[PDB]
């Protein structure tokens, strides 16, 4: 194990004040640090903590080639779509995981942060696209979507749609329509050179045994 | 696919010479035929064409056990009441749609067919009833209505009333007081073979490739 000691900045991801819209999701790169995941999997905060290709309790034993933390807000009934092989407006047009995903998907209800008494409309999702999004592709365009045969010429009209729609979040919504903050931790467990490692304590180097 | 024949008899519904009164609305059952709904929807003359749970282009891609076509004349400003969850003398006493309706409502102005210079009084509607209709219930009864305490004994009087009233369609009426022909299409899928379908398109043949 390498002899660095600075802990990874997960507080800057999970305790950020504003999250992104799911069409315009954030990505943070995590590198050259000690990743204690126990602060995450021993927390009582999270309504979802699903790991893929790894188990949560094993994470403090591992080293990771690179780590990415991706952040956005969605509805409670859309957290289902943040998994490998899924489909629907979020998986198809906003945020796609690869089928071979290695990492963890973490989500908590944020109806006390991301809802306002008149409705909060700051958060959006893409409703229309010509084709499905590739794994970890991002699309922040606002071209008018052409649903039919005639060109739109950058103007909404018959079969010509603005591609993004807002989530209106009220504190009174049923839980499947409340806002959830989602973090996706993504990493490669292949034995390439690794700058992120769990809190493991190294021994001396013993030879001829 | 085999070439397109046995088209559904929508011309017998939409181009009938005389329509029903709304209290005595006609029902036609459509089965065992090819239904090109886009030939209806692309036709001119429809002042209303509203679909619930379906779209006309998607109906050409769907199959049903039966289609029901219900038809009648109403006043032009009563067409508002031919929808899920509506109230008023048409929706309440004459023709009721369910709240879970799957179907299309089509209406057009028929002033040149259904008005007379002497006034046309051949079309009637139910003015008085004990209680509101069930969805797709019909009531052709002519028993004298009682608003008072005495039994009317089949005789009109002080507050004993004939339950049906005529429209008086004059060609000079304002457009809300003119006659409108209405067709409601209900799509039915059972535990049975889907005998009604949209037309299947064919390419050319390509031999030697």
């Amino acid at each position: 194990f390498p002899n660095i000691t600075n802990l990874c900045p997960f507080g800057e991801v999970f305790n950020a004040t504003r999250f992104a819209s799911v069409y315009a999701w954030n990505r943070k790169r995590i590198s050259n640090c000690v990743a204690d995941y126990s602060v995450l999997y021993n927390s009582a905060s999270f309504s979802t903590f699903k790991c893929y290709g790894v188990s949560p309790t094993k994470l403090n034993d591992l080293c990771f080639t690179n780590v990415y933390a991706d952040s956005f807000v969605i509805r409670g009934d859309e957290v289902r779509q943040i998994a490998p092989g899924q489909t629907g407006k979020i998986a198809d047009y906003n945020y796609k995981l690869p089928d071979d995903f290695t990492g963890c998907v973490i989500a908590w209800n944020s109806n006390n942060l991301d809802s306002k008494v008149g409705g909060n409309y700051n958060y959006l999702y893409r409703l229309f696209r010509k084709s499905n999004l590739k794994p970890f592709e991002r699309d922040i365009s606002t071209e008018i979507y052409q649903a039919g045969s005639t060109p739109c010429n950058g103007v909404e009209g018959f079969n010509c749609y603005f591609p993004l729609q807002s989530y209106g979040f009220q504190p009174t919504n049923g839980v499947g329509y409340q806002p959830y903050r989602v973090v996706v931790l993504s990493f490669e467990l292949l034995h390439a050179p690794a700058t992120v490692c769990g809190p493991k304590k190294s021994t001396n180097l013993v030879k001829n045994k | 696919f085999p070439n397109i024949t046995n088209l559904c008899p929508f011309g017998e519904v939409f181009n009938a010479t005389r329509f029903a009164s709304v209290y005595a609305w006609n029902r036609k059952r459509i089965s065992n035929c090819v239904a090109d709904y886009s030939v209806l929807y692309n036709s001119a003359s429809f002042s209303t064409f509203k679909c619930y749970g379906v779209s006309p282009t998607k109906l050409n891609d769907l199959c049903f056990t039966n289609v029901y076509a219900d038809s009648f004349v109403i006043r032009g400003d009563e067409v508002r009441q031919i929808a899920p969850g509506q109230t008023g003398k048409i929706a309440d006493y004459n023709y009721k749609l369910p709240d879970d309706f799957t179907g299309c409502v089509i209406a057009w102005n028929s002033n040149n067919l259904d008005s007379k210079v002497g006034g046309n009084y051949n079309y009637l509607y139910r003015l008085f009833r004990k209680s509101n209709l069930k969805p797709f219930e019909r009531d052709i009864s002519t028993e004298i209505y009682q608003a008072g305490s005495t039994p009317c004994n089949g005789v009109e009087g002080f507050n004993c009333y004939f339950p049906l009233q005529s429209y008086g369609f004059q060609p000079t009426n304002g457009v809300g007081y003119q006659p409108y022909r209405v067709v409601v299409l209900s799509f039915e899928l059972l535990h049975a073979p889907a005998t009604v379908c949209g037309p299947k398109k064919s390419t050319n043949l390509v031999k030697n490739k």
């Epitope: 010429n153 950058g154 103007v155 018959f158 749609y161 603005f162 993004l164 807002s166 | -």
Partner: antibody, heavy 117, light 108 residues
Framework: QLQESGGGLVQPGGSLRLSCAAS????????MNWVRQAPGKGLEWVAV????????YYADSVKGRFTISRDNAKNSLYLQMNSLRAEDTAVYYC????????????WGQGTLVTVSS | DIQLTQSPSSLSASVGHRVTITCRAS??????LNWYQQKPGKAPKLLIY???SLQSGVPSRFSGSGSGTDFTLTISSLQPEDFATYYC?????????FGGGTKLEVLG
């Protein structure tokens, strides 16, 4: 919030430039419109411009005579008006118009242009 | 160019009445028809979009219907804040056109 500026009295055959400043929404994402209302009359659309300025369209009453423009760095919409007639006397409004997708609409407070000798 | 006719040019009503106003297009526009309210010296406020969809924060007493050429706006139980001028607008093609709005001008 939308705020129109640049109105007032003008001589017939003259020119004017309207401007409209946007605050509290992503102006850069949207088509924007000019709409007008002559004193005691109904609403009348004037012109539209795309989110990036690539396409522009006009009413036939104003085509050639008026030009619509924007810059998204300044959150600002403009209407250059030339060959002003007495016919052009109206409150002019700066607006985001809804079509078929749910969103928040915005209309400015409107600015009055008066054209007479 | 699509012409829109608004049928009652002015209405008179009292608080708690139902009110209806109608708009009639010169060609089919599917469901592409907005409704606006305007009060004297203020900008228009959008009530209904598509032809039936209630705009964010608008009172549930307003409703729209129509798909084709004939459209209606209703006010289910009229209130002291509803006495205003009402405009339809087609969203279907350019130029964007408005109906000559209905006044609702007796307050009682």
């Amino acid at each position: 919030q939308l705020q129109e500026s640049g109105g007032g009295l003008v001589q017939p055959g003259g020119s004017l430039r309207l401007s409209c400043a946007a605050s509290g929404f992503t102006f850069s994402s949207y088509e924007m419109n000019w709409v007008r209302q002559a004193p005691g009359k109904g609403l009348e659309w004037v012109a539209v411009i795309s989110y990036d300025g690539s396409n522009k369209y006009y009413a036939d009453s104003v085509k050639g005579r008026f030009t619509i423009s924007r810059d998204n760095a300044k959150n600002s919409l403009y209407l250059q008006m030339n060959s002003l007639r007495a016919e052009d006397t109206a409150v002019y409004y700066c607006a985001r118009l809804i079509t078929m997708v749910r969103g928040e609409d915005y209309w400015g407070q409107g600015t009055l242009v008066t054209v007479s000798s | 160019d699509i012409q829109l006719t608004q049928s009652p040019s002015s209405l008179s009503a009292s608080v708690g009445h139902r009110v209806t106003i109608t708009c009639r297009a010169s060609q089919s526009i599917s469901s592409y028809l907005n409704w606006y309210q305007q009060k004297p010296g203020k900008a228009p406020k959008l009530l209904i979009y598509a032809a039936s969809s209630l705009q964010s924060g608008v009172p549930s007493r307003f409703s729209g219907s129509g798909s084709g050429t004939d459209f209606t706006l209703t006010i289910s139980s009229l209130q002291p804040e509803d006495f205003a001028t009402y405009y339809c607008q087609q969203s279907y093609n350019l130029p964007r056109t408005f109906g000559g709005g209905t006044k609702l001008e007796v307050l009682g």
